[PDB]
Amino acid sequence: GPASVPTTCCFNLANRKIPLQRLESYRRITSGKCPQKAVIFKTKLAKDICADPKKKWVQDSMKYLDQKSPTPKP
């Protein structure tokens, strides 16, 4: 589901568009200790999924959370 074996960064991007009502949060990665860069979405089922920033639902999803979100800090 979320991981497979190498714990570093997402690899298997999500194909099934995730809904907003079920979305809880999201996490993006782009550090230097990773082979690739992408985003990760979290639904309201205590589960995380991989997502690339070149999708239509991921972009809207990220923009949605980024828009709905108030401001970062922690």
mmCIF file of N, CA, C and O in Angstrom:
data_model
loop_
_atom_site.group_PDB
_atom_site.id
_atom_site.type_symbol
_atom_site.label_atom_id
_atom_site.label_comp_id
_atom_site.label_asym_id
_atom_site.label_seq_id
_atom_site.Cartn_x
_atom_site.Cartn_y
_atom_site.Cartn_z
ATOM 1 N N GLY A 1 0.861 -1.218 0.000
ATOM 2 C CA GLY A 1 0.000 0.000 0.000
ATOM 3 C C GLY A 1 0.883 1.251 0.000
ATOM 4 O O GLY A 1 1.089 1.867 -1.046
ATOM 5 N N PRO A 2 1.419 1.646 1.167
ATOM 6 C CA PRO A 2 2.281 2.837 1.266
ATOM 7 C C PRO A 2 3.726 2.549 0.866
ATOM 8 O O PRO A 2 4.308 3.248 0.036
ATOM 9 N N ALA A 3 4.298 1.510 1.470
ATOM 10 C CA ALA A 3 5.677 1.133 1.171
ATOM 11 C C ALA A 3 5.733 -0.288 0.621
ATOM 12 O O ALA A 3 4.718 -0.978 0.539
ATOM 13 N N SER A 4 6.934 -0.718 0.246
ATOM 14 C CA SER A 4 7.117 -2.061 -0.297
ATOM 15 C C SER A 4 8.337 -2.729 0.330
ATOM 16 O O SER A 4 8.247 -3.826 0.878
ATOM 17 N N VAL A 5 9.477 -2.049 0.245
ATOM 18 C CA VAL A 5 10.712 -2.581 0.807
ATOM 19 C C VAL A 5 11.689 -1.424 1.120
ATOM 20 O O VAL A 5 11.975 -1.167 2.290
ATOM 21 N N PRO A 6 12.209 -0.704 0.107
ATOM 22 C CA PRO A 6 13.139 0.418 0.363
ATOM 23 C C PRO A 6 12.432 1.647 0.932
ATOM 24 O O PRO A 6 11.637 2.295 0.251
ATOM 25 N N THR A 7 12.732 1.955 2.191
ATOM 26 C CA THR A 7 12.122 3.107 2.848
ATOM 27 C C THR A 7 12.944 4.365 2.587
ATOM 28 O O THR A 7 13.914 4.649 3.289
ATOM 29 N N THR A 8 12.541 5.118 1.566
ATOM 30 C CA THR A 8 13.246 6.347 1.215
ATOM 31 C C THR A 8 12.280 7.357 0.606
ATOM 32 O O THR A 8 12.040 8.427 1.163
ATOM 33 N N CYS A 9 11.730 7.000 -0.549
ATOM 34 C CA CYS A 9 10.787 7.876 -1.238
ATOM 35 C C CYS A 9 9.788 7.049 -2.046
ATOM 36 O O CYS A 9 10.026 5.878 -2.342
ATOM 37 N N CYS A 10 8.667 7.675 -2.396
ATOM 38 C CA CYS A 10 7.633 6.991 -3.170
ATOM 39 C C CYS A 10 8.182 6.543 -4.521
ATOM 40 O O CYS A 10 9.083 7.169 -5.080
ATOM 41 N N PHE A 11 7.625 5.452 -5.037
ATOM 42 C CA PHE A 11 8.062 4.921 -6.326
ATOM 43 C C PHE A 11 6.855 4.581 -7.193
ATOM 44 O O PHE A 11 6.790 4.949 -8.367
ATOM 45 N N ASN A 12 5.901 3.875 -6.600
ATOM 46 C CA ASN A 12 4.690 3.486 -7.319
ATOM 47 C C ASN A 12 3.621 4.563 -7.175
ATOM 48 O O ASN A 12 2.856 4.573 -6.210
ATOM 49 N N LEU A 13 3.578 5.470 -8.147
ATOM 50 C CA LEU A 13 2.599 6.555 -8.123
ATOM 51 C C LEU A 13 1.181 5.998 -8.148
ATOM 52 O O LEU A 13 0.933 4.906 -8.659
ATOM 53 N N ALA A 14 0.249 6.764 -7.585
ATOM 54 C CA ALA A 14 -1.148 6.343 -7.544
ATOM 55 C C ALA A 14 -1.836 6.640 -8.871
ATOM 56 O O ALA A 14 -1.627 7.694 -9.473
ATOM 57 N N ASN A 15 -2.663 5.700 -9.320
ATOM 58 C CA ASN A 15 -3.383 5.870 -10.577
ATOM 59 C C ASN A 15 -4.829 6.273 -10.307
ATOM 60 O O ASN A 15 -5.415 7.072 -11.040
ATOM 61 N N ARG A 16 -5.396 5.713 -9.243
ATOM 62 C CA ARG A 16 -6.774 6.022 -8.875
ATOM 63 C C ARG A 16 -6.841 7.364 -8.155
ATOM 64 O O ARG A 16 -6.239 7.547 -7.098
ATOM 65 N N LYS A 17 -7.578 8.304 -8.744
ATOM 66 C CA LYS A 17 -7.718 9.633 -8.153
ATOM 67 C C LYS A 17 -8.320 9.543 -6.752
ATOM 68 O O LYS A 17 -9.337 8.885 -6.538
ATOM 69 N N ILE A 18 -7.677 10.217 -5.802
ATOM 70 C CA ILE A 18 -8.151 10.213 -4.422
ATOM 71 C C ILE A 18 -9.135 11.372 -4.203
ATOM 72 O O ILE A 18 -8.916 12.471 -4.710
ATOM 73 N N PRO A 19 -10.232 11.153 -3.455
ATOM 74 C CA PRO A 19 -11.222 12.217 -3.208
ATOM 75 C C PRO A 19 -10.783 13.191 -2.118
ATOM 76 O O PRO A 19 -9.900 12.892 -1.315
ATOM 77 N N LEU A 20 -11.407 14.365 -2.113
ATOM 78 C CA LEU A 20 -11.074 15.392 -1.130
ATOM 79 C C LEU A 20 -11.757 15.117 0.205
ATOM 80 O O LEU A 20 -11.165 15.296 1.270
ATOM 81 N N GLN A 21 -13.012 14.686 0.139
ATOM 82 C CA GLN A 21 -13.775 14.395 1.353
ATOM 83 C C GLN A 21 -13.084 13.318 2.184
ATOM 84 O O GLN A 21 -13.185 13.302 3.411
ATOM 85 N N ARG A 22 -12.379 12.420 1.505
ATOM 86 C CA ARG A 22 -11.672 11.345 2.190
ATOM 87 C C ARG A 22 -10.234 11.751 2.528
ATOM 88 O O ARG A 22 -9.557 11.074 3.300
ATOM 89 N N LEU A 23 -9.766 12.854 1.941
ATOM 90 C CA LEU A 23 -8.403 13.315 2.195
ATOM 91 C C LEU A 23 -8.269 13.862 3.613
ATOM 92 O O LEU A 23 -9.180 14.498 4.142
ATOM 93 N N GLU A 24 -7.110 13.610 4.213
ATOM 94 C CA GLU A 24 -6.837 14.081 5.567
ATOM 95 C C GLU A 24 -5.641 15.030 5.562
ATOM 96 O O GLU A 24 -5.640 16.057 6.240
ATOM 97 N N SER A 25 -4.621 14.672 4.784
ATOM 98 C CA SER A 25 -3.420 15.492 4.686
ATOM 99 C C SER A 25 -2.540 14.991 3.545
ATOM 100 O O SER A 25 -2.884 14.029 2.857
ATOM 101 N N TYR A 26 -1.402 15.648 3.348
ATOM 102 C CA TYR A 26 -0.487 15.248 2.284
ATOM 103 C C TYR A 26 0.954 15.605 2.653
ATOM 104 O O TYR A 26 1.201 16.523 3.437
ATOM 105 N N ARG A 27 1.897 14.865 2.082
ATOM 106 C CA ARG A 27 3.310 15.109 2.362
ATOM 107 C C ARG A 27 4.141 14.984 1.088
ATOM 108 O O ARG A 27 4.056 13.989 0.369
ATOM 109 N N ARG A 28 4.949 16.006 0.822
ATOM 110 C CA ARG A 28 5.800 16.004 -0.363
ATOM 111 C C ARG A 28 7.256 15.798 0.035
ATOM 112 O O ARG A 28 7.688 16.218 1.109
ATOM 113 N N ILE A 29 8.008 15.143 -0.842
ATOM 114 C CA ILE A 29 9.415 14.877 -0.576
ATOM 115 C C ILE A 29 10.280 15.366 -1.736
ATOM 116 O O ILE A 29 9.919 15.219 -2.903
ATOM 117 N N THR A 30 11.427 15.945 -1.396
ATOM 118 C CA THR A 30 12.346 16.452 -2.410
ATOM 119 C C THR A 30 13.721 16.712 -1.797
ATOM 120 O O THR A 30 14.436 17.626 -2.205
ATOM 121 N N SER A 31 14.076 15.896 -0.809
ATOM 122 C CA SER A 31 15.361 16.041 -0.138
ATOM 123 C C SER A 31 16.494 15.552 -1.036
ATOM 124 O O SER A 31 16.288 15.252 -2.213
ATOM 125 N N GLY A 32 17.694 15.476 -0.467
ATOM 126 C CA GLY A 32 18.860 15.022 -1.220
ATOM 127 C C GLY A 32 19.165 13.542 -0.964
ATOM 128 O O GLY A 32 20.003 12.950 -1.643
ATOM 129 N N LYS A 33 18.484 12.946 0.020
ATOM 130 C CA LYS A 33 18.710 11.538 0.336
ATOM 131 C C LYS A 33 17.642 10.659 -0.310
ATOM 132 O O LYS A 33 17.295 9.598 0.208
ATOM 133 N N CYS A 34 17.126 11.110 -1.451
ATOM 134 C CA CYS A 34 16.099 10.352 -2.161
ATOM 135 C C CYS A 34 16.456 10.240 -3.648
ATOM 136 O O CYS A 34 17.096 11.135 -4.203
ATOM 137 N N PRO A 35 16.051 9.147 -4.317
ATOM 138 C CA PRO A 35 16.348 8.955 -5.748
ATOM 139 C C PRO A 35 15.357 9.682 -6.653
ATOM 140 O O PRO A 35 15.686 10.072 -7.773
ATOM 141 N N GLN A 36 14.137 9.856 -6.153
ATOM 142 C CA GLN A 36 13.099 10.535 -6.922
ATOM 143 C C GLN A 36 12.328 11.507 -6.033
ATOM 144 O O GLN A 36 12.492 11.518 -4.813
ATOM 145 N N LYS A 37 11.485 12.322 -6.659
ATOM 146 C CA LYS A 37 10.688 13.296 -5.918
ATOM 147 C C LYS A 37 9.215 13.175 -6.298
ATOM 148 O O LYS A 37 8.869 13.051 -7.472
ATOM 149 N N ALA A 38 8.352 13.213 -5.286
ATOM 150 C CA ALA A 38 6.915 13.105 -5.522
ATOM 151 C C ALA A 38 6.135 13.538 -4.284
ATOM 152 O O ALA A 38 6.705 14.051 -3.322
ATOM 153 N N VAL A 39 4.823 13.324 -4.323
ATOM 154 C CA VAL A 39 3.963 13.695 -3.202
ATOM 155 C C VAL A 39 3.254 12.460 -2.651
ATOM 156 O O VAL A 39 3.109 11.448 -3.336
ATOM 157 N N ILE A 40 2.804 12.568 -1.406
ATOM 158 C CA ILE A 40 2.092 11.470 -0.760
ATOM 159 C C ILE A 40 0.808 11.994 -0.133
ATOM 160 O O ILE A 40 0.814 12.994 0.584
ATOM 161 N N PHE A 41 -0.298 11.318 -0.416
ATOM 162 C CA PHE A 41 -1.587 11.741 0.121
ATOM 163 C C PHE A 41 -2.054 10.796 1.221
ATOM 164 O O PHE A 41 -1.735 9.606 1.220
ATOM 165 N N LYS A 42 -2.828 11.342 2.153
ATOM 166 C CA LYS A 42 -3.356 10.547 3.257
ATOM 167 C C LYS A 42 -4.864 10.738 3.352
ATOM 168 O O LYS A 42 -5.361 11.862 3.417
ATOM 169 N N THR A 43 -5.585 9.626 3.356
ATOM 170 C CA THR A 43 -7.042 9.673 3.440
ATOM 171 C C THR A 43 -7.483 9.644 4.903
ATOM 172 O O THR A 43 -6.670 9.823 5.810
ATOM 173 N N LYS A 44 -8.775 9.415 5.126
ATOM 174 C CA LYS A 44 -9.304 9.364 6.487
ATOM 175 C C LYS A 44 -9.424 7.918 6.965
ATOM 176 O O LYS A 44 -10.281 7.594 7.788
ATOM 177 N N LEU A 45 -8.556 7.054 6.444
ATOM 178 C CA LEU A 45 -8.573 5.645 6.827
ATOM 179 C C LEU A 45 -7.222 5.220 7.411
ATOM 180 O O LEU A 45 -6.898 4.034 7.449
ATOM 181 N N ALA A 46 -6.436 6.198 7.866
ATOM 182 C CA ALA A 46 -5.126 5.903 8.444
ATOM 183 C C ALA A 46 -4.229 5.213 7.419
ATOM 184 O O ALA A 46 -3.446 4.323 7.754
ATOM 185 N N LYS A 47 -4.353 5.632 6.162
ATOM 186 C CA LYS A 47 -3.547 5.047 5.093
ATOM 187 C C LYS A 47 -2.931 6.139 4.227
ATOM 188 O O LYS A 47 -3.537 7.186 3.996
ATOM 189 N N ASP A 48 -1.717 5.883 3.747
ATOM 190 C CA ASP A 48 -1.021 6.849 2.902
ATOM 191 C C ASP A 48 -0.805 6.274 1.505
ATOM 192 O O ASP A 48 -0.616 5.069 1.338
ATOM 193 N N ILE A 49 -0.837 7.150 0.505
ATOM 194 C CA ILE A 49 -0.646 6.720 -0.878
ATOM 195 C C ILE A 49 0.317 7.660 -1.599
ATOM 196 O O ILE A 49 0.428 8.838 -1.258
ATOM 197 N N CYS A 50 1.007 7.125 -2.601
ATOM 198 C CA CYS A 50 1.957 7.923 -3.371
ATOM 199 C C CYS A 50 1.231 8.690 -4.472
ATOM 200 O O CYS A 50 0.176 8.271 -4.948
ATOM 201 N N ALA A 51 1.805 9.824 -4.867
ATOM 202 C CA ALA A 51 1.203 10.649 -5.911
ATOM 203 C C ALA A 51 2.249 11.568 -6.535
ATOM 204 O O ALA A 51 3.071 12.160 -5.837
ATOM 205 N N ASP A 52 2.202 11.687 -7.859
ATOM 206 C CA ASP A 52 3.142 12.543 -8.570
ATOM 207 C C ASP A 52 2.534 13.932 -8.770
ATOM 208 O O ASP A 52 1.313 14.072 -8.820
ATOM 209 N N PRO A 53 3.365 14.980 -8.885
ATOM 210 C CA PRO A 53 2.865 16.357 -9.071
ATOM 211 C C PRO A 53 2.514 16.700 -10.521
ATOM 212 O O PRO A 53 2.311 17.866 -10.858
ATOM 213 N N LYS A 54 2.443 15.684 -11.381
ATOM 214 C CA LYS A 54 2.113 15.918 -12.785
ATOM 215 C C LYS A 54 0.720 15.381 -13.130
ATOM 216 O O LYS A 54 0.391 15.209 -14.303
ATOM 217 N N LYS A 55 -0.100 15.118 -12.109
ATOM 218 C CA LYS A 55 -1.446 14.606 -12.354
ATOM 219 C C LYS A 55 -2.472 15.728 -12.242
ATOM 220 O O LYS A 55 -2.156 16.839 -11.818
ATOM 221 N N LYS A 56 -3.710 15.423 -12.625
ATOM 222 C CA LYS A 56 -4.779 16.410 -12.563
ATOM 223 C C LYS A 56 -5.453 16.380 -11.196
ATOM 224 O O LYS A 56 -5.899 17.408 -10.687
ATOM 225 N N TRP A 57 -5.516 15.193 -10.600
ATOM 226 C CA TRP A 57 -6.133 15.055 -9.289
ATOM 227 C C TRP A 57 -5.112 15.337 -8.187
ATOM 228 O O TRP A 57 -5.471 15.768 -7.091
ATOM 229 N N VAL A 58 -3.833 15.112 -8.492
ATOM 230 C CA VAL A 58 -2.779 15.372 -7.517
ATOM 231 C C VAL A 58 -2.546 16.875 -7.417
ATOM 232 O O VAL A 58 -2.388 17.423 -6.328
ATOM 233 N N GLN A 59 -2.530 17.536 -8.570
ATOM 234 C CA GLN A 59 -2.322 18.978 -8.603
ATOM 235 C C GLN A 59 -3.459 19.678 -7.875
ATOM 236 O O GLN A 59 -3.238 20.542 -7.027
ATOM 237 N N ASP A 60 -4.681 19.275 -8.203
ATOM 238 C CA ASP A 60 -5.849 19.852 -7.556
ATOM 239 C C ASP A 60 -5.855 19.461 -6.084
ATOM 240 O O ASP A 60 -6.253 20.240 -5.217
ATOM 241 N N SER A 61 -5.394 18.242 -5.816
ATOM 242 C CA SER A 61 -5.332 17.744 -4.447
ATOM 243 C C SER A 61 -4.346 18.576 -3.636
ATOM 244 O O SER A 61 -4.672 19.080 -2.562
ATOM 245 N N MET A 62 -3.135 18.718 -4.169
ATOM 246 C CA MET A 62 -2.104 19.499 -3.489
ATOM 247 C C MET A 62 -2.553 20.948 -3.340
ATOM 248 O O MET A 62 -2.416 21.549 -2.276
ATOM 249 N N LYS A 63 -3.103 21.497 -4.419
ATOM 250 C CA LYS A 63 -3.585 22.873 -4.394
ATOM 251 C C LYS A 63 -4.744 22.994 -3.411
ATOM 252 O O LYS A 63 -4.904 24.005 -2.731
ATOM 253 N N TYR A 64 -5.543 21.932 -3.344
ATOM 254 C CA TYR A 64 -6.688 21.900 -2.442
ATOM 255 C C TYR A 64 -6.210 21.995 -0.995
ATOM 256 O O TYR A 64 -6.660 22.850 -0.232
ATOM 257 N N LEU A 65 -5.295 21.107 -0.631
ATOM 258 C CA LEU A 65 -4.761 21.099 0.724
ATOM 259 C C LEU A 65 -3.971 22.373 0.980
ATOM 260 O O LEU A 65 -4.069 22.987 2.043
ATOM 261 N N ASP A 66 -3.192 22.766 -0.019
ATOM 262 C CA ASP A 66 -2.386 23.975 0.086
ATOM 263 C C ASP A 66 -3.285 25.197 0.236
ATOM 264 O O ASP A 66 -2.936 26.165 0.913
ATOM 265 N N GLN A 67 -4.449 25.144 -0.408
ATOM 266 C CA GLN A 67 -5.393 26.251 -0.346
ATOM 267 C C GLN A 67 -6.214 26.183 0.936
ATOM 268 O O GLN A 67 -6.361 27.174 1.653
ATOM 269 N N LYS A 68 -6.749 25.000 1.215
ATOM 270 C CA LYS A 68 -7.561 24.801 2.411
ATOM 271 C C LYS A 68 -6.719 24.982 3.668
ATOM 272 O O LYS A 68 -7.201 25.471 4.690
ATOM 273 N N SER A 69 -5.455 24.579 3.586
ATOM 274 C CA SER A 69 -4.549 24.700 4.726
ATOM 275 C C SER A 69 -4.391 26.171 5.133
ATOM 276 O O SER A 69 -4.425 27.057 4.279
ATOM 277 N N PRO A 70 -4.218 26.456 6.436
ATOM 278 C CA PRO A 70 -4.058 27.842 6.914
ATOM 279 C C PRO A 70 -2.625 28.348 6.779
ATOM 280 O O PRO A 70 -2.366 29.366 6.136
ATOM 281 N N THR A 71 -1.701 27.624 7.399
ATOM 282 C CA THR A 71 -0.290 27.999 7.352
ATOM 283 C C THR A 71 0.569 26.928 8.033
ATOM 284 O O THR A 71 0.119 26.283 8.981
ATOM 285 N N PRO A 72 1.813 26.719 7.569
ATOM 286 C CA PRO A 72 2.705 25.708 8.165
ATOM 287 C C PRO A 72 3.407 26.217 9.424
ATOM 288 O O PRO A 72 3.288 27.386 9.788
ATOM 289 N N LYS A 73 4.144 25.322 10.079
ATOM 290 C CA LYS A 73 4.871 25.681 11.298
ATOM 291 C C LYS A 73 5.581 24.449 11.879
ATOM 292 O O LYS A 73 6.795 24.473 12.081
ATOM 293 N N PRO A 74 4.847 23.354 12.157
ATOM 294 C CA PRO A 74 5.463 22.135 12.716
ATOM 295 C C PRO A 74 6.130 21.274 11.646
ATOM 296 O O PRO A 74 5.509 21.049 10.621
#
